[PDB]
Design a protein around this ligand. Sequence first.
Ligand SMILES: Cc1[nH][nH]c(=O)c1CCO
Ligand SMILES: [Cl-]
Ligand SMILES: [Cl-]
Length: 163
Amino acid sequence: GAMAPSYRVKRMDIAKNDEECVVNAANPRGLPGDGVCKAVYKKWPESFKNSATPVGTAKTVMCGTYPVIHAVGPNFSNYTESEGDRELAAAYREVAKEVTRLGVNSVAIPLLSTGVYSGGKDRLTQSLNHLFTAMDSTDADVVIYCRDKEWEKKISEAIQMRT
Ligand SMILES: Cc1[nH][nH]c(=O)c1CCO
Ligand SMILES: [Cl-]
Ligand SMILES: [Cl-]
């Protein structure tokens, strides 16, 4: 584990992370996809061998020795708010199990079911609070990656507010 487990946020491409493993915002079919998934596909295409996995689950595939944790959040266009909320919490619980299993000291994580799977709604708080619920009991350093300047501020505020 990390000597003093922390949460941090950075505004940049998760493909350039400085962590021991990465969480992909995957689709269920292990396709290259869009947004974070497409960036992950360019950087670690070898990790898409047999990466298909159901909604609400995570599946780790190594790129060399670098673990890519494919986490499938729900697409809120298809799920009800209630069922989507349940599957989004579940995906993050499965990420925490894999991060623990791998024994990493740090993980790079995007906010699942924001962007294309958000169903046109702002889900920063929903997604971040499910991330915290799952990762709080882990001792890895967690680095959250985002692209929007206002989201960076709001994620930073949410981290600092619980300190
Ligand atoms: C600005 C931003 N970053 N990620 C997102 O999902 C959005 C739109 C929210 O409605
Ligand atoms: Cl960048
Ligand atoms: Cl963002």
